Amino acid sequence: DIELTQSPAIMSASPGEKVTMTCSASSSLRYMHWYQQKSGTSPKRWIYDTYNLASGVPVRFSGSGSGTSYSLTISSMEAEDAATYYCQQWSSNPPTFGAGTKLELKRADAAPTVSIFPPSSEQLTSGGASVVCFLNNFYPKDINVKWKIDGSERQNGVLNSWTDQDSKDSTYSMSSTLTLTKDEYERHNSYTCEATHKTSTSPIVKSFNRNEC
Amino acid sequence: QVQLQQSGSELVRPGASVKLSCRASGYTFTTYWMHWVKQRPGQGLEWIGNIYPHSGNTNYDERFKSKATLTVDTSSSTAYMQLSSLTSEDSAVYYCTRDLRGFAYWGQGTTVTVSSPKTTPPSVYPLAPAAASMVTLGCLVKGYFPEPVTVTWNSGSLSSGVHTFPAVLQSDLYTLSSSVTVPSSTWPSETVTCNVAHPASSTKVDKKIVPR
Numbered sequence: 001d002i003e004l005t006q007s008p009a010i011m012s013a014s015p016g017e018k019v020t021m022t023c024s025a026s027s028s029l030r031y032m033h034w035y036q037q038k039s040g041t042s043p044k045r046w047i048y049d050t051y052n053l054a055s056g057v058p059v060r061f062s063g064s065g066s067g068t069s070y071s072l073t074i075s076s077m078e079a080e081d082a083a084t085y086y087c088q089q090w091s092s093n094p095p096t097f098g099a100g101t102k103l104e105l106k107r108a109d110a111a112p113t114v115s116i117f118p119p120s121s122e123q124l125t126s127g128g129a130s131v132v133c134f135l136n137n138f139y140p141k142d143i144n145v146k147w148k149i150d151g152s153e154r155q156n157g158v159l160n161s162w163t164d165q166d167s168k169d170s171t172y173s174m175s176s177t178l179t180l181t182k183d184e185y186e187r188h189n190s191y192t193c194e195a196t197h198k199t200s201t202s203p204i205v206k207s208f209n210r211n212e213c
Numbered sequence: 214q215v216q217l218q219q220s221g222s223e224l225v226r227p228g229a230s231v232k233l234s235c236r237a238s239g240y241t242f243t244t245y246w247m248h249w250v251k252q253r254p255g256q257g258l259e260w261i262g263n264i265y266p267h268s269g270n271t272n273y274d275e276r277f278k279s280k281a282t283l284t285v286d287t288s289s290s291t292a293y294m295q296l297s298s299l300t301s302e303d304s305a306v307y308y309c310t311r312d313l314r315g316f317a318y319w320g321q322g323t324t325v326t327v328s329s330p331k332t333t334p335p336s337v338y339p340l341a342p343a344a345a346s347m348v349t350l351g352c353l354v355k356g357y358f359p360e361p362v363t364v365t366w367n368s369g370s371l372s373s374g375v376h377t378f379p380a381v382l383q384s385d386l387y388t389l390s391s392s393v394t395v396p397s398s399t400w401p402s403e404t405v406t407c408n409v410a411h412p413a414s415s416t417k418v419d420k421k422i423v424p425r
């Protein structure tokens with residue numbers, strides 16, 4: 001009371017399965033619009049008047065849904081059916097529109113690599129301490145990350161960036177990165193990361209010290 | 214075809230009147246509803262309002278009133294969507310949907326970041342380790358204030374394993390990443406560099422990567 005959006009948030013389907021969308025509305029309507037908004041680029045039109053057509057959308061896309069519930073069903077997911085789809089309704093007190101349905105083509109789940117990097121000389125002379133551990137080429141999206149230095153955990157200054165979906169590997173690559181200051185680096189010795197993932201049982205752990213140069 | 218796109222606007226000093234210029238000329242002139250769609254980096258699509266050219270009726274919405282005017286001029290065929298008396302929350306991508314049965318004809322869009330900031334130059338710090346077949350590379354950026362930044366690797370010869378990382382926020386400074394993978398036959402054989410640029414500060418920082 002009162003927000004209207006599409007009901008399932010983040011989906012995932014292999015190329016060949018059924019992709020059925022579901023939009024929920026705060027008030028009833030008659031016509032419903034559907035879009036294909038790719039990441040970075042402007043959205044297009046996909047399905048208007050709840051079923052009709054578009055300019056470049058294929059014949060396999062189907063849609064329906066009257067009242068406060070809408071449904072745009074893909075008959076079989078292909079390589080070009082991976083987009084964030086939003087709905088709309090012209091008004092006369094707009095509801096307003098929803099968020100968008102992110103979805104990724106499913107494949108074999110791959111285990112990442114965790115590359116920790118020591119800070120060089122030029123950063124500590126300027127006075128910085130930024131230890132990273134780049135998680136590259138994993139599947140699926142979710143990793144419960146942990147930064148623990150010298151036995152105990154550390155969660156302050158931890159930043160997390162998500163490189164978007166790739167086209168040649170079709171995986172994701174993260175940058176697990178915490179930021180400290182130049183005096184907080186010379187009191188802790190072994191800097192490491194554990195990547196808790198559902199593929200491998202034990203997280204891959206690399207260690208390095210400060211007394212070696 | 215509806216030509217061509219929308220215009221750009223940068224950070225303006227607080228108190229002046231910025232103005233967008235939405236240049237859709239696909240005539241069709243002049244009876245339609247130029248609805249302006251605005252979306253945050255929170256991926257939600259919001260509505261800024263519409264304008265009508267035949268008589269002059271505009272509109273507004275509760276989260277963007279007072280005073281976002283949508284002026285119309287059929288001689289230049291543009292639609293204006295800039296909001297005055299603004300705050301920092303107007304830093305969002307601003308589209309231009311034309312009218313059909315749906316919202317069929319969009320523009321390309323612009324993001325206008327508005328504050329009272331200071332433009333800070335970037336600084337390339339070397340991320341190189343001090344063993345295995347392939348080693349990932351990179352160079353960190355720390356503390357550039359406006360969102361224009363540049364991402365290159367070897368100026369168009371080693372752009373294979375470049376992953377484009379977002380500049381998520383902490384302490385009002387943008388921090389992204391650009392990691393590339395190198396094989397052991399070229400490291401440290403060829404001299405790899407990363408050259409990032411900031412258009413808003415007009416500052417170029419370069420660094421050659423050395424094995425430590």
